Amino acid sequence: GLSAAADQTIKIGAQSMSESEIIASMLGQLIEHHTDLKTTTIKNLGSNAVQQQALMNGEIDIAATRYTGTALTGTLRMEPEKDPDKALALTQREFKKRYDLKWYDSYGFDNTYAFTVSKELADQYHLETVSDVKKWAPQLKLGVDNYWMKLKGNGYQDFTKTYGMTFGGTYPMQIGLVYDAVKSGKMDIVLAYSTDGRIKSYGLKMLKDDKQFFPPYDCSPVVPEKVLKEHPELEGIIKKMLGKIDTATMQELNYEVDGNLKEPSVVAKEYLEKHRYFES
Numbered sequence: 001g002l003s004a005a006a007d008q009t010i011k012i013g014a015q016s017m018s019e020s021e022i023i024a025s026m027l028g029q030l031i032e033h034h035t036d037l038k039t040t041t042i043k044n045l046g047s048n049a050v051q052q053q054a055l056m057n058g059e060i061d062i063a064a065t066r067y068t069g070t071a072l073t074g075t076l077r078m079e080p081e082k083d084p085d086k087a088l089a090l091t092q093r094e095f096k097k098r099y100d101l102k103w104y105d106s107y108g109f110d111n112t113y114a115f116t117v118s119k120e121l122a123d124q125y126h127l128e129t130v131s132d133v134k135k136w137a138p139q140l141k142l143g144v145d146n147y148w149m150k151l152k153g154n155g156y157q158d159f160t161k162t163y164g165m166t167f168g169g170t171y172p173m174q175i176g177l178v179y180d181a182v183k184s185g186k187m188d189i190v191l192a193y194s195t196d197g198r199i200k201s202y203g204l205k206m207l208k209d210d211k212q213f214f215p216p217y218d219c220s221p222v223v224p225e226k227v228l229k230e231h232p233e234l235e236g237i238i239k240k241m242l243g244k245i246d247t248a249t250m251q252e253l254n255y256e257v258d259g260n261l262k263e264p265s266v267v268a269k270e271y272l273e274k275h276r277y278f279e280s
């Protein structure tokens with residue numbers, strides 16, 4: 001019954017990404033900093049859709065990182081809203097209405113799909129925007145994640161319609177591999193994730209999505225209203241992380257895992273100590 005609520009463990013989900021492991025660790029540590037709640041991390045959820053079902057079936061009590069553009073198209077099956085503020089507002093409204101899920105305001109960073117080349121390619125062919133690559137598309141191999149080609153929504157098929165180009169070859173692979181694939185010249189162009197730490201490190205160039213094909217992908221935690229009711233301290237704790245972690249910061253945190261070979265929990269703890277757990 002209710003008087004046992006404070007002895008329940010808060011299960012925090014992470015997708016198969018370094019960024020999601022870092023944020024799920026950081027939120028679990030902040031919750032334990034403030035309360036006597038135990039927390040655990042449920043790792044390796046494969047996708048937006050898996051995080052969704054784990055929230056609805058009790059497998060996780062908090063999804064640490066969900067992305068507006070992904071959930072708009074993929075969960076809600078709505079037309080992709082292009083304005084950041086409108087997309088967030090629509091997502092929060094529909095998540096509450098449809099699922100009784102609370103989609104919080106963003107941590108402060110967006111992690112968008114970004115068409116990405118070597119700085120050498122971009123400098124040789126004067127490539128700044130996605131529209132600049134149109135005339136070259138047939139002679140480029142595009143590396144993509146193991147998930148993006150199968151999206152009916154803001155996927156490849158609609159991309160080719162809006163930009164009127166088709167790549168010579170498309171090669172789906174684990175996201176973590178696209179950075180070295182483009183750096184080594186195995187791929188000519190990759191659909192990277194914009195908060196990856198290796199983009200800067202590896203000397204890569206993101207091309208502007210001048211036609212605004214992509215929705216925003218602002219990142220937030222998502223929690224069932226039932227969990228917030230039963231643990232009324234959680235909302236005030238979650239709020240402490242919101243709007244505090246910008247894209248540059250998330251890139252540096254990702255680099256600590258993928259480039260400096262640190263455990264996501266260690267990266268999360270050192271960030272919390274550097275910033276005094278968000279209140280000094």
Ligand SMILES: C[SH](C)CCC(=O)O
Nearest residue numbers: 067070111112113193
């Ligand atoms: C963060 S978007 C670049 C792709 C990953 C996802 O949304 O699941």
